[PDB]
Enzyme design. Sequence first.
Site, PDB file in Angstrom:
ATOM      1  N   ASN A 125      77.647  19.973  72.945  1.00  0.00           N
ATOM      2  CA  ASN A 125      76.718  21.090  72.760  1.00  0.00           C
ATOM      3  C   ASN A 125      77.236  22.410  73.326  1.00  0.00           C
ATOM      4  OD1 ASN A 125      74.820  19.802  71.136  1.00  0.00           O
ATOM      5  ND2 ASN A 125      73.751  18.931  72.903  1.00  0.00           N
ATOM      6  N   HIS A 132      66.713  15.586  82.729  1.00  0.00           N
ATOM      7  CA  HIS A 132      67.962  15.776  82.013  1.00  0.00           C
ATOM      8  C   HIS A 132      68.477  17.190  82.228  1.00  0.00           C
ATOM      9  CE1 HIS A 132      70.408  16.411  78.207  1.00  0.00           C
ATOM     10  NE2 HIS A 132      70.994  15.372  78.776  1.00  0.00           N
ATOM     11  N   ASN A 148      74.593  17.357  79.219  1.00  0.00           N
ATOM     12  CA  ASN A 148      74.843  17.253  77.781  1.00  0.00           C
ATOM     13  C   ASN A 148      74.515  18.492  76.953  1.00  0.00           C
ATOM     14  OD1 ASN A 148      75.807  14.550  78.063  1.00  0.00           O
ATOM     15  ND2 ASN A 148      73.700  13.830  78.129  1.00  0.00           N
ATOM     16  N   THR A 192      69.087   8.289  72.858  1.00  0.00           N
ATOM     17  CA  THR A 192      68.334   8.766  71.705  1.00  0.00           C
ATOM     18  C   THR A 192      68.663   7.894  70.499  1.00  0.00           C
ATOM     19  OG1 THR A 192      68.185  11.054  72.484  1.00  0.00           O
ATOM     20  CG2 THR A 192      68.144  10.709  70.103  1.00  0.00           C
ATOM     21  N   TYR A 207      71.902  20.493  76.898  1.00  0.00           N
ATOM     22  CA  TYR A 207      70.513  20.818  76.584  1.00  0.00           C
ATOM     23  C   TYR A 207      70.069  22.045  77.405  1.00  0.00           C
ATOM     24  CZ  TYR A 207      69.760  16.810  73.483  1.00  0.00           C
ATOM     25  OH  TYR A 207      69.808  15.928  72.424  1.00  0.00           O
TER      26      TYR A 207
HETATM   27  C1  LIG Z   1      73.501   7.350  70.312  1.00  0.00           C
HETATM   28  C2  LIG Z   1      73.517   8.018  71.657  1.00  0.00           C
HETATM   29  C3  LIG Z   1      72.354   8.600  72.151  1.00  0.00           C
HETATM   30  C4  LIG Z   1      72.332   9.204  73.404  1.00  0.00           C
HETATM   31  N1  LIG Z   1      71.172   9.794  73.875  1.00  0.00           N
HETATM   32  C5  LIG Z   1      71.152  10.378  75.128  1.00  0.00           C
HETATM   33  C6  LIG Z   1      69.984  10.938  75.641  1.00  0.00           C
HETATM   34  O1  LIG Z   1      68.911  10.924  75.034  1.00  0.00           O
HETATM   35  N2  LIG Z   1      70.017  11.521  76.888  1.00  0.00           N
HETATM   36  C7  LIG Z   1      71.180  11.551  77.631  1.00  0.00           C
HETATM   37  O2  LIG Z   1      71.192  12.074  78.741  1.00  0.00           O
HETATM   38  N3  LIG Z   1      72.334  10.993  77.139  1.00  0.00           N
HETATM   39  C8  LIG Z   1      72.314  10.400  75.899  1.00  0.00           C
HETATM   40  N4  LIG Z   1      73.474   9.838  75.423  1.00  0.00           N
HETATM   41  C9  LIG Z   1      74.695   9.830  76.295  1.00  0.00           C
HETATM   42  C10 LIG Z   1      74.705   8.441  76.991  1.00  0.00           C
HETATM   43  O3  LIG Z   1      73.625   8.236  77.899  1.00  0.00           O
HETATM   44  C11 LIG Z   1      75.996   8.101  77.743  1.00  0.00           C
HETATM   45  O4  LIG Z   1      76.203   9.038  78.779  1.00  0.00           O
HETATM   46  C12 LIG Z   1      77.223   8.093  76.833  1.00  0.00           C
HETATM   47  O5  LIG Z   1      76.970   7.370  75.643  1.00  0.00           O
HETATM   48  C13 LIG Z   1      78.476   7.551  77.526  1.00  0.00           C
HETATM   49  O6  LIG Z   1      78.303   6.222  77.985  1.00  0.00           O
HETATM   50  P1  LIG Z   1      78.914   4.983  77.137  1.00  0.00           P
HETATM   51  O7  LIG Z   1      80.403   5.200  76.965  1.00  0.00           O
HETATM   52  O8  LIG Z   1      78.604   3.749  77.963  1.00  0.00           O
HETATM   53  O9  LIG Z   1      78.215   4.960  75.785  1.00  0.00           O
HETATM   54  C14 LIG Z   1      73.493   9.239  74.174  1.00  0.00           C
HETATM   55  C15 LIG Z   1      74.657   8.652  73.686  1.00  0.00           C
HETATM   56  C16 LIG Z   1      74.677   8.048  72.429  1.00  0.00           C
HETATM   57  C17 LIG Z   1      75.945   7.426  71.914  1.00  0.00           C
HETATM   58  O1  LIG Z   2      71.823  13.945  75.590  1.00  0.00           O
HETATM   59  C1  LIG Z   2      71.969  13.549  74.437  1.00  0.00           C
HETATM   60  C2  LIG Z   2      73.300  13.082  73.868  1.00  0.00           C
HETATM   61  C3  LIG Z   2      72.929  12.709  72.440  1.00  0.00           C
HETATM   62  C4  LIG Z   2      71.428  12.999  72.344  1.00  0.00           C
HETATM   63  C5  LIG Z   2      70.947  13.469  73.495  1.00  0.00           C
HETATM   64  C6  LIG Z   2      69.488  13.858  73.725  1.00  0.00           C
HETATM   65  O2  LIG Z   2      68.793  13.986  72.480  1.00  0.00           O
END
Ligand SMILES: Cc1cc2nc3c(=O)[nH]c(=O)nc-3n(C[C@H](O)[C@H](O)[C@H](O)COP(=O)(O)O)c2cc1C
Ligand SMILES: O=C1CCC=C1CO
Lengths: 399, 399
Positions: free
Chosen positions: B251, B191, B194, B37, B196
Amino acid sequence: SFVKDFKPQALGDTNLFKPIKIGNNELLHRAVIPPLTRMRALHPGNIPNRDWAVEYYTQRAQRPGTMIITEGAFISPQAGGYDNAPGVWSEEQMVEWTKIFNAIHEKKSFVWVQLIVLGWAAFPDNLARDGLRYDSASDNVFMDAEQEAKAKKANNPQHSLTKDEIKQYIKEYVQAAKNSIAAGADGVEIHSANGYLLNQFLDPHSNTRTDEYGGSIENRARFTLEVVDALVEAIGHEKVGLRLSPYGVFNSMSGGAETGIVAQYAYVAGELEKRAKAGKRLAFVHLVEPRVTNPFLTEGEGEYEGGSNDFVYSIWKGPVIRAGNFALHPEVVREEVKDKRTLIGYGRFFISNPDLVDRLEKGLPLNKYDRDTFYQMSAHGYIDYPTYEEALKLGWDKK
Amino acid sequence: SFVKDFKPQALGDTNLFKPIKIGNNELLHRAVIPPLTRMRALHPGNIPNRDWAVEYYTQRAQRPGTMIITEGAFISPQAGGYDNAPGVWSEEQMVEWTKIFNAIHEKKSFVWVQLIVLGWAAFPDNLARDGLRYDSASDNVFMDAEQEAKAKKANNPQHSLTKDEIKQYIKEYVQAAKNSIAAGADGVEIHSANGYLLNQFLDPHSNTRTDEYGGSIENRARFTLEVVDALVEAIGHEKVGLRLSPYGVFNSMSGGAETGIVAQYAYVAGELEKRAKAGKRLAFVHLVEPRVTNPFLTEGEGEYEGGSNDFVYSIWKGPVIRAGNFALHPEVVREEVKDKRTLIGYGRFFISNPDLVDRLEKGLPLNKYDRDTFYQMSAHGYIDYPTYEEALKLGWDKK
Ligand SMILES: Cc1cc2nc3c(=O)[nH]c(=O)nc-3n(C[C@H](O)[C@H](O)[C@H](O)COP(=O)(O)O)c2cc1C
Ligand SMILES: O=C1CCC=C1CO
Ligand SMILES: Cc1cc2nc3c(=O)[nH]c(=O)nc-3n(C[C@H](O)[C@H](O)[C@H](O)COP(=O)(O)O)c2cc1C
Ligand SMILES: O=C1CCC=C1CO
Ligand SMILES: [Mg+2]
Ligand SMILES: [Mg+2]
Ligand SMILES: [Mg+2]
Ligand SMILES: [Mg+2]
């Protein structure tokens, strides 16, 4: 003779030889004798063998601070069905058990009674002879065709337990646990593995019930957890362990072929950890490894490679005993015991090596076992396996 | 600038650089862009950013054969509540998504739309403004005090979904999946992680329901599995993946503190494997690692050491994508990818390194990310992070 193609490894430099407390017992090493049915109990009355059982256990208690889990012991006549396995319901039986426990304690070792209930693994004709039911979770699925047929011939067709009958078993578990402790045991292990009655409830193949004891993960685990709770209340959590075999197929359990099997066992582990966090932590969880899905197959056979018991460690945070083909695999044990709450059960090679612990510490050759005498009414293959010293005197280093 | 205290490792000699097929897509390497996101969608209408989104995805598609999972996209207005996250329900939205998918495909990469439904993570005042409910599994437990209070102030108190409303969400998931495929996506990711809406149903903290959608493992998994089945029916199992975060606390999910958490996720994995064995295997399961229980904590923080996702591999036998603090830990990736069905999601460092895959292959320095611009309405910190070549030209090797 010694096992021919075995390359021993000294394990004295590993955690296998670090002390650990299990329940009330200060173990001096982590090589455990798992429960081993030997069929030397005498009929009538399922009496521990008056001639040989003390000697058998004394021999295997010889390393100070060894944890010994007894052969499975029937909690009541209705729980039985093998004439030569022992019980723990009668005065006659407990007289013999007391001698066994005293002997183990004299060797500065410890003894936990495994409590068993056969369910569909029982012989229906023995049960019929004695005026007893042939019990399981369900009445429309059977261990095998031979058992189903034997039950019908004996006018004793497999019976799905009523709730009242489940409660009666629970009463018998409680009294059996009390008997065991009063006679001198250090604790009890609840057998919920290897396709016996509790496992028959855990497993969706054998449990087709639609009441509160079947039809969901929580429902299938109900009986096992009720036994756990009843025993914890009766004799204390520090005197109670639980045995599980998630990937076992022995006695017609599902094993890994059931996609829900890990969830079923994860639920049980979670419920034990919940109780532990609430102040009642079981002394241990004992797991049969997927290394041995059927203990009557030679080591290396029936090994399930599609699953691991490691999941249990993410859930249950207490001691874990693992059993299954470890004697011939010191290289695997060396890695497993790096986890500081892991103990190793050695079954078949404790049958054949009364001094197994010394042999593991020092990396000595192992006596081959004789499967033909695993279940015999004999001292032969029971109390006449030699220690390493005795084997050398017999010239086994040159056979 | 480059990350200062990082010692890169070339991963080109590992399975990270072996091709693998995921759904219909022939990936050329196993470094996946997980959903991220970014909040560049424009209001009104939750429209993917008309100025910058194509460029953002084009940059990150630059290594041929990369699997990209989009930022979460709302399936309907009722599923939303963040004004600057995109949707996939309207013609206006799909016009922009089509451009994005075309751009990714021109780079010979692949794109999977993550479908999200916020539940209690939504902003209740945005929802009230638009005449929408504030939804969750239950109505008597809340994400936090601020969310509960905002909902009340907005005359929009948290609402426990009726069965009819669950069915309506399912209809919207189906249509969103259809929209995504019709617009050119290679697949969708459901999804269920996290914290949701689907996770709010999975988790016993957030789900206090007493109907068929709560109160047991099977009941809590019902909604997630209904969405899986509806999408498999609509667009095919080869175009559907599922994301889970067993140990997540983001969350207000339970994580490892819930002793039943592994069982809950093991059940879901088992149900997916059951479907797979029956001929409908999902393209992948995507797991957030306990390495990152909250993605807004700096790498190394919020690491849960008391659990592992390894249990999933004993159950689900298809591809597994793992995400969480892997960019800074090539030594961990080197070990994980020895498993031949494991892919690695790199989130935050794909934000800051459009050429991440090259950098992983060759063991190059990584661009530091700028957390302040993770959610900004700006090209800055979105499309202006340099490739390694561009960084050298900027003198970053000397900053
Ligand atoms: C800015 C940001 C936005 C994210 N948006 C989503 C999302 O839309 N859907 C989701 O399942 N996880 C989302 N995540 C979680 C990431 O997909 C990922 O699981 C998490 O950042 C850990 O991996 P990393 O250490 O490589 O960043 C988001 C994480 C960050 C930091
Ligand atoms: O799942 C995640 C982690 C941060 C934002 C989302 C979706 O909006
Ligand atoms: C002869 C024999 C008797 C056994 N009896 C029992 C028993 O009474 N209760 C039980 O839980 N397991 C019993 N088992 C299973 C063992 O405890 C153990 O899990 C199995 O033999 C695998 O370990 P191993 O490879 O070290 O022998 C028995 C196994 C054998 C070979
Ligand atoms: O559990 C097992 C395996 C072999 C015999 C028993 C109990 O009688
Ligand atoms: Mg009948
Ligand atoms: Mg012979
Ligand atoms: Mg209300
Ligand atoms: Mg700044």
